[PDB]
Design a protein around this ligand. Sequence first.
Ligand SMILES: Nc1nc2c(ncn2[C@@H]2O[C@H](COP(=O)(O)O)[C@@H](O)[C@H]2O)c(=O)[nH]1
Ligand SMILES: Nc1nc2c(ncn2[C@@H]2O[C@H](COP(=O)(O)O)[C@@H](O)[C@H]2O)c(=O)[nH]1
Ligand SMILES: [Mn+2]
Ligand SMILES: [Mn+2]
Ligand SMILES: [Mn+2]
Ligand SMILES: [Mn+2]
Lengths: 340, 340
Amino acid sequence: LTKVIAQAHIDHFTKWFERADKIVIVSHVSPDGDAIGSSLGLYHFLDSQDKIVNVIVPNAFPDFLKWMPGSKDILLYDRYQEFADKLIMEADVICCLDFNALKRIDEMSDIVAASPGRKIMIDHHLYPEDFCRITISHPEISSTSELVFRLICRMGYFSDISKEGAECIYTGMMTDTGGFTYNSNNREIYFIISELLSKGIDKDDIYRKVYNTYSESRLRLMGYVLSNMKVYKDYNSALISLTKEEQGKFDYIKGDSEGFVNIPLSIKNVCFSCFLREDTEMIKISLRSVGKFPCNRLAAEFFNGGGHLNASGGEFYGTMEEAVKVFEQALEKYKPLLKE
Amino acid sequence: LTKVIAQAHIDHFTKWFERADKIVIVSHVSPDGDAIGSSLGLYHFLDSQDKIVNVIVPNAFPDFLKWMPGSKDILLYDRYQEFADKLIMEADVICCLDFNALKRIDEMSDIVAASPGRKIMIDHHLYPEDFCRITISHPEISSTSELVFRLICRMGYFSDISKEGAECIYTGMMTDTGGFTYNSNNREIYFIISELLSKGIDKDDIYRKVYNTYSESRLRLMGYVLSNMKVYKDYNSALISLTKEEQGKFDYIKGDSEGFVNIPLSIKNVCFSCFLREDTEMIKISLRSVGKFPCNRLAAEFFNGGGHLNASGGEFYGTMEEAVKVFEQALEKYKPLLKE
Ligand SMILES: Nc1nc2c(ncn2[C@@H]2O[C@H](COP(=O)(O)O)[C@@H](O)[C@H]2O)c(=O)[nH]1
Ligand SMILES: Nc1nc2c(ncn2[C@@H]2O[C@H](COP(=O)(O)O)[C@@H](O)[C@H]2O)c(=O)[nH]1
Ligand SMILES: [Mn+2]
Ligand SMILES: [Mn+2]
Ligand SMILES: [Mn+2]
Ligand SMILES: [Mn+2]
């Protein structure tokens, strides 16, 4: 309903749009629901508009996202670099969805930066770089998927949004809000949900296909991590872990411990959650927080990383109680902040 | 938006409404989010309309529902029967929200049935009895909370719905859809969410106050049950359990194992989930299912109970592997259905 995107930007992109013949859509390393959804959504739109479109991500994406229309044709740069470089270098327009720093598409940086094709960035993360000639950056919006839906509507093609395109955009929105349980207080989100529903999607099904589909090993693996988690009541934090030794017990396939770092946050008075997953061999740190505790800050001040205010990670080389000690001092330092 | 409730019923209730001075609102035994929310919502509305209102439930309600505006004044029939009987017998109007059979308000049946006050039933469960002079029964709607919002709007008081009233109605809707993850595919649900948001509520907060607030003992208790659950891959079912012996280990307070029977349903190809919680002393059975497997049917054909298509329970007197055996034959019988 409300105009969030600059009408100017919209007009300028519309110009590139009609002139363009070959468009390439790119997203960040380790594509997540919003990354794949927003890109597949734009892809479907652009594709119905008599245009050559190719979605290229740096990496592989979760299996719970394979059911999406078009995922099969998403080109993974780490296995077809050659082909991709050609597509990228020959593109008229290059849409960068869901990331605002070239370092984010790690590996693809060079070729994307090198391409003479005009670039446009549609994102919602804070502090956007200026490598794109057109920049649609709105941190005030919950997902890239959502403003890809706004951009298409503002351009007058709401009617041209297919059910497949609608399924993807909704997935991206759902994902970045954890099923609309955080950063979803804006009314318009629900007007859009209602509109997508009118394209024929089954939101309840999309939900199950992403969150309620996975081996009994993963769910049991979870039950394990939960029993062994440690809760530092006075620091309002919590820590869960997994050694290569443990991973082998439950036959850990990559992606099992997903969303595990979140579970601890559902405890009454625990707003900071840490997950130390011993990488096969040193320790993989994942930070999550409800409220305003800056995870990205402790992520950089103790585990050579970064990320966002509520979610971020990084690695610490050593062992289990070694990482734990590190985490435990990080806690002692921020104990007063963790108290506010 | 769409007219779901019979304009006639609305007009008839409006008549009782203006004439009435003292109104009593009742809900089902073991009130859940929809029960407390829909009742507190109507209460707040009726109360702003210069009327005497009293919410009386047969039982105590979860603590994760205590934050709601007005819960403190909800009269529990099992501790103030005398007072309540007076309120009930003297009421001009008696609203029965979220149940359609007198047996549902177990204990309160007699006095409610005896009261000369005119009754109205607002519910969404299947097969409604006819003890109320006015009956608003719509199984096609996801919550009682939702059509209490429709009834108030149809009556022309959308503007008179307070933020407190809005907080309650939203909670009821969220609860009965498990955070809008099931039976929520209807567009209008989201128009209503958007409207409530405009009353000033913080849906994200309401969410955390109900689902992300509970001791580390409960979450750990869960991690335990999950590690020990059994999955009958070929029957597409799963079973989790808790003996009084176990409950004591994790210091089980009533309500800990809530929503536990659901967790197993998130496994890829497990649509039936059984929870045998050994009651302190014989076994408490809880059945849940995704899809269409009739839980209420197996609930009655093996554990002297009943309930709904997707959720229901009942008790089986004996021991752990005794209940398990029972459950295991129930499976063998319906193995072919569980296969479709
Ligand atoms: N700069 C930086 N960011 C990271 C690192 N690890 C994780 N992140 C950020 O945090 C998010 C992932 O959190 P995770 O899923 O690993 O718990 C990603 O979106 C990513 O931007 C890291 O080592 N360095
Ligand atoms: N008739 C009948 N219904 C039950 C019984 N136990 C549970 N239910 C139904 O199933 C729901 C509770 O499922 P639960 O939370 O115990 O797993 C309630 O709404 C209730 O109507 C029982 O023993 N008899
Ligand atoms: Mn993303
Ligand atoms: Mn995003
Ligand atoms: Mn109910
Ligand atoms: Mn209900």
